[PDB]
Scaffold this active site. Structure first.
Site, PDB file in Angstrom:
ATOM      1  N   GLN A 127      49.715  17.636-108.768  1.00  0.00           N
ATOM      2  CA  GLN A 127      50.374  16.587-108.012  1.00  0.00           C
ATOM      3  C   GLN A 127      50.791  15.418-108.911  1.00  0.00           C
ATOM      4  O   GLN A 127      51.650  14.630-108.544  1.00  0.00           O
ATOM      5  CB  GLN A 127      49.493  16.113-106.846  1.00  0.00           C
ATOM      6  CG  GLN A 127      48.170  15.503-107.235  1.00  0.00           C
ATOM      7  CD  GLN A 127      47.323  15.141-106.026  1.00  0.00           C
ATOM      8  OE1 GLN A 127      46.726  16.010-105.393  1.00  0.00           O
ATOM      9  NE2 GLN A 127      47.248  13.849-105.717  1.00  0.00           N
ATOM     10  N   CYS A 168      48.387  14.784-102.285  1.00  0.00           N
ATOM     11  CA  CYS A 168      47.382  15.809-102.024  1.00  0.00           C
ATOM     12  C   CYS A 168      47.539  16.464-100.654  1.00  0.00           C
ATOM     13  O   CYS A 168      47.358  17.675-100.516  1.00  0.00           O
ATOM     14  CB  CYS A 168      45.988  15.202-102.137  1.00  0.00           C
ATOM     15  SG  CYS A 168      45.678  13.879-100.930  1.00  0.00           S
ATOM     16  N   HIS A 179      41.249  12.839 -99.080  1.00  0.00           N
ATOM     17  CA  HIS A 179      41.858  13.855 -99.928  1.00  0.00           C
ATOM     18  C   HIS A 179      42.069  15.151 -99.144  1.00  0.00           C
ATOM     19  O   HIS A 179      41.290  15.479 -98.252  1.00  0.00           O
ATOM     20  CB  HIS A 179      40.943  14.100-101.129  1.00  0.00           C
ATOM     21  CG  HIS A 179      41.478  15.083-102.121  1.00  0.00           C
ATOM     22  ND1 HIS A 179      42.800  15.111-102.504  1.00  0.00           N
ATOM     23  CD2 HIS A 179      40.855  16.044-102.842  1.00  0.00           C
ATOM     24  CE1 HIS A 179      42.969  16.045-103.425  1.00  0.00           C
ATOM     25  NE2 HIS A 179      41.805  16.625-103.646  1.00  0.00           N
ATOM     26  N   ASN A 196      42.014  22.948-105.541  1.00  0.00           N
ATOM     27  CA  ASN A 196      42.452  21.558-105.676  1.00  0.00           C
ATOM     28  C   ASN A 196      43.860  21.526-106.278  1.00  0.00           C
ATOM     29  O   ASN A 196      44.412  22.576-106.630  1.00  0.00           O
ATOM     30  CB  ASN A 196      41.461  20.781-106.558  1.00  0.00           C
ATOM     31  CG  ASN A 196      41.453  19.282-106.264  1.00  0.00           C
ATOM     32  OD1 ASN A 196      42.146  18.805-105.361  1.00  0.00           O
ATOM     33  ND2 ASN A 196      40.662  18.541-107.022  1.00  0.00           N
TER      34      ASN A 196
HETATM   35  C1  LIG Z   1      45.545  12.414-102.027  1.00  0.00           C
HETATM   36  C2  LIG Z   1      44.670  11.769-102.803  1.00  0.00           C
HETATM   37  S1  LIG Z   1      44.189  12.040-104.380  1.00  0.00           S
HETATM   38  O1  LIG Z   1      44.916  11.003-105.022  1.00  0.00           O
HETATM   39  O2  LIG Z   1      44.516  13.383-104.819  1.00  0.00           O
HETATM   40  N1  LIG Z   1      42.583  11.734-104.536  1.00  0.00           N
HETATM   41  O3  LIG Z   1      42.044  10.469-104.109  1.00  0.00           O
HETATM   42  C3  LIG Z   1      40.640  10.557-104.218  1.00  0.00           C
HETATM   43  C4  LIG Z   1      40.041   9.215-103.992  1.00  0.00           C
HETATM   44  C5  LIG Z   1      39.353   8.573-105.037  1.00  0.00           C
HETATM   45  C6  LIG Z   1      38.831   7.284-104.843  1.00  0.00           C
HETATM   46  C7  LIG Z   1      38.997   6.648-103.592  1.00  0.00           C
HETATM   47  C8  LIG Z   1      39.674   7.302-102.541  1.00  0.00           C
HETATM   48  C9  LIG Z   1      40.205   8.582-102.754  1.00  0.00           C
HETATM   49  C10 LIG Z   1      46.019  11.470-100.944  1.00  0.00           C
HETATM   50  C11 LIG Z   1      46.187  10.056-101.584  1.00  0.00           C
HETATM   51  C12 LIG Z   1      46.825   9.000-100.702  1.00  0.00           C
HETATM   52  C13 LIG Z   1      46.849   7.654-101.368  1.00  0.00           C
HETATM   53  C14 LIG Z   1      46.537   6.533-100.581  1.00  0.00           C
HETATM   54  C15 LIG Z   1      46.617   5.237-101.113  1.00  0.00           C
HETATM   55  C16 LIG Z   1      47.014   5.061-102.442  1.00  0.00           C
HETATM   56  C17 LIG Z   1      47.334   6.175-103.234  1.00  0.00           C
HETATM   57  C18 LIG Z   1      47.251   7.466-102.702  1.00  0.00           C
HETATM   58  N2  LIG Z   1      45.138  11.355 -99.792  1.00  0.00           N
HETATM   59  C19 LIG Z   1      45.709  11.455 -98.568  1.00  0.00           C
HETATM   60  O4  LIG Z   1      46.917  11.686 -98.460  1.00  0.00           O
HETATM   61  C20 LIG Z   1      44.789  11.362 -97.386  1.00  0.00           C
HETATM   62  C21 LIG Z   1      44.461  12.827 -96.989  1.00  0.00           C
HETATM   63  C22 LIG Z   1      43.746  12.939 -95.682  1.00  0.00           C
HETATM   64  C23 LIG Z   1      44.074  14.023 -94.864  1.00  0.00           C
HETATM   65  C24 LIG Z   1      43.530  14.118 -93.577  1.00  0.00           C
HETATM   66  C25 LIG Z   1      42.659  13.122 -93.108  1.00  0.00           C
HETATM   67  C26 LIG Z   1      42.324  12.043 -93.932  1.00  0.00           C
HETATM   68  C27 LIG Z   1      42.862  11.952 -95.223  1.00  0.00           C
HETATM   69  N3  LIG Z   1      45.394  10.540 -96.295  1.00  0.00           N
HETATM   70  C28 LIG Z   1      45.813   9.224 -96.516  1.00  0.00           C
HETATM   71  O5  LIG Z   1      45.586   8.650 -97.599  1.00  0.00           O
HETATM   72  N4  LIG Z   1      46.539   8.584 -95.515  1.00  0.00           N
HETATM   73  C29 LIG Z   1      47.289   7.331 -95.832  1.00  0.00           C
HETATM   74  C30 LIG Z   1      47.338   6.398 -94.611  1.00  0.00           C
HETATM   75  N5  LIG Z   1      47.872   7.123 -93.416  1.00  0.00           N
HETATM   76  C31 LIG Z   1      47.823   6.219 -92.253  1.00  0.00           C
HETATM   77  C32 LIG Z   1      47.022   8.295 -93.083  1.00  0.00           C
HETATM   78  C33 LIG Z   1      46.974   9.277 -94.267  1.00  0.00           C
END
Ligand SMILES: *[C@H](CS(=O)(=O)NOCc1ccccc1)[C@H](CCc1ccccc1)NC(=O)[C@H](Cc1ccccc1)NC(=O)N1CCN(C)CC1
Length: 215
Positions: free
Chosen positions: A19, A25, A162, A182
Site C-alpha cells: 500500500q 489498507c 487496520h 497483510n
Molecule cells: C490502514 C491503515 S495502516 O496505515 O495500514 N496501519 O495503521 C496501523 C495503526 C498504527 C498506529 C495507530 C493506528 C493505526 C487504514 C489507515 C487509515 C488512516 C487514518 C488516518 C490517517 C492515516 C491513515 N485504516 C483504515 O482505513 C481503517 C480500517 C478499518 C476498517 C473497518 C473498521 C475499522 C477500521 N478505517 C479508518 O481509518 N477510517 C477512517 C475514518 N472513517 C470515518 C472510518 C474509516
C-alpha cells in the site's frame, strides 16, 4: 469444522501487495477478499484494483481510511458490481496522494452482487472461512509494526484501525492461530503474513468480519 485450513495452499490467494505511504489498507482488505471469492466462484485468479476504490469510492476516505463494508456497498450500488483488473487500473497511491477517479479505459475483472457480514464469534468465522474462503477483517494493528515472526499471543486490542485478510487457521497447534495476509510488502512479518492467536479475540479480530458475494 476442519482442524486446519490454508487457502494460500489451494491457490486461492494472490501475491502480497504494497500500500506504500497511503492508508489504503481497507481497499487491500476488500479487494483481496474479492480476488479470492472470484477465484472460488470458478474463474482464474486475477489481480484486481485497489486504486479503483481509493480514487472512486466517495463514501470512503482514500489514503485517510475507510471501511470494507462501505467498499462492498459502493461496488454494488455505484459501480454496477464491477471491480476492475489491476493491470487496467494500477495502484498509484504509494506516495500518499491518490489520483482522480477515471471511469474509462479499464477492464472489468470481477463482479459481486453484495456482501455478508459475519457474527462476532471466532468459531463461526472459522466455520464460514472453511467452507466459503478468505474473510476481510478489521483489527488493531498498533503493535504490528514490531512483528517479525511467530504466533502473536499478546496483541494490543483497543481500537479497530487496520484492514486485513483472513486466509486460514490451525486449531491443532500448541497455540491455535489465524493466518492473516497483510499489505505492507513481503519484507514484513512472515513473507507478508502474520499469525495471531485464535480464541481470545486477539487484535479485536472478530469485531468486523465480512465477505463479498459473487456466486
Ligand atoms: C490502514 C491503515 S495502516 O496505515 O495500514 N496501519 O495503521 C496501523 C495503526 C498504527 C498506529 C495507530 C493506528 C493505526 C487504514 C489507515 C487509515 C488512516 C487514518 C488516518 C490517517 C492515516 C491513515 N485504516 C483504515 O482505513 C481503517 C480500517 C478499518 C476498517 C473497518 C473498521 C475499522 C477500521 N478505517 C479508518 O481509518 N477510517 C477512517 C475514518 N472513517 C470515518 C472510518 C474509516
Amino acid at each position: 469444522a476442519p482442524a486446519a485450513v490454508d487457502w494460500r495452499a489451494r491457490g486461492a490467494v494472490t501475491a502480497v501487495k504494497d500500500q506504500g505511504q497511503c492508508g489504503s489498507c481497507w481497499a487491500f482488505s476488500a479487494i483481496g477478499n474479492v480476488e479470492c471469492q472470484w477465484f472460488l466462484a470458478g474463474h482464474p485468479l486475477t489481480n484486481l484494483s485497489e486504486q479503483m476504490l481509493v480514487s472512486c469510492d466517495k463514501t470512503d476516505s482514500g489514503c485517510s481510511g475507510g471501511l470494507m463494508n462501505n467498499a462492498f456497498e459502493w461496488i454494488v450500488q455505484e459501480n454496477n458490481g464491477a471491480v476492475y483488473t489491476e493491470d487496467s487500473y494500477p495502484y498509484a497511491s504509494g506516495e500518499g496522494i491518490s489520483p482522480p477517479c477515471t471511469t474509462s479505459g479499464h477492464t472489468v475483472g470481477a463482479t459481486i452482487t453484495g456482501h455478508v457480514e459475519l457474527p462476532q464469534d471466532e468459531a463461526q468465522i472459522a466455520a464460514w472461512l472453511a467452507v466459503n474462503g478468505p474473510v476481510a477483517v478489521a483489527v488493531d494493528a498498533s503493535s504490528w509494526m514490531t512483528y517479525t515472526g511467530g504466533v502473536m499471543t499478546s496483541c494490543v486490542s483497543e481500537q479497530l484501525d487496520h484492514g486485513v485478510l483472513l486466509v486460514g487457521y490451525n486449531d491443532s497447534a500448541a497455540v491455535p492461530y489465524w493466518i492473516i495476509k497483510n499489505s505492507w510488502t513481503t519484507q514484513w512479518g512472515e513473507e507478508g503474513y502474520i499469525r495471531i492467536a485464535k480464541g481470545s479475540n486477539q487484535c479485536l479480530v472478530k469485531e468486523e468480519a465480512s465477505s463479498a458475494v459473487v456466486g
